[PDB]
Symmetry: none
């Protein structure tokens, strides 16, 4: 069972800031990682797949990189609309596991 | 892109009550369906995969069924521990898409 | 006296959603079950009798199924005029008893 550890568990930054979030797998998951955004009271929405491919329609201010067991999610310039909780999930094998999630706030 | 349709959005019931949630896929997903439980403030937890398959450690009071397009998730006896949000997610094809979630509460 | 267990107590869904309501009989009641609709402040109106027979003039989006002690009421596409409290009632023996009812609302 692949353990996903995400950090930090939460942060607050200002509009325009560069935000960064990490997820480490307990095994090489061969780049099968997704980043999801979950707005308060809504279902998670896929942002990035294959570690670094943006889903069609996602703003380019969003980006992911990494490989092996360490992955990185970055938001190059924070918008008020990005206030949500972010999650990484491994899809290298079942059961698909999630990171603990990172709440992103403004201020 | 595959659309998942979940219902109801929220329910309220009493301890021991049977709870029924369903998900509708916009295409045959071949049982490539997962059910997650999301307790407040936490990441989603896989309860069932392959539409009917229980993950180890998950109480037998949970159960899933369905096929092609229609799927159902059932909680045979609502326990206090079961208060959370539940989601179905398709994994037949990327991007993996979620149902809107159902908020389960005890009256 | 025959006890009727109805689930859930209340729910919220969106226009077009499918809605499932359940009723459990503490005894087999040979399909002698009626489903009533009760809008706010009016008397209950019979929608279905004999567990699955639609009364004349009732829309095809309502359906009933079930047997022995397990009965099911479905609305395939929730319309705004469907907002009300639903009740199952057994007519197998006196005194005829009702389920606790299900408050259906739209989010």
């Amino acid at each position: 069972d692949i353990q996903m550890t995400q950090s930090p568990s939460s942060l607050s930054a200002s509009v325009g800031d560069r935000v960064t979030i990490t997820c480490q797998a307990s095994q090489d998951i061969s780049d099968y990682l997704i980043w999801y955004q979950q707005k308060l009271g809504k279902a998670p929405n896929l942002l990035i797949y294959d570690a670094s491919t943006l889903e069609t329609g996602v703003p380019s201010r969003f980006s992911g990189s990494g490989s092996g067991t360490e992955y990185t999610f970055t938001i190059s310039s924070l918008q008020p609309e990005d206030i949500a909780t972010y999650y990484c999930q491994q899809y290298d094998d079942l059961p698909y596991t999630f990171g603990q999630g990172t709440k992103v706030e403004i201020k």
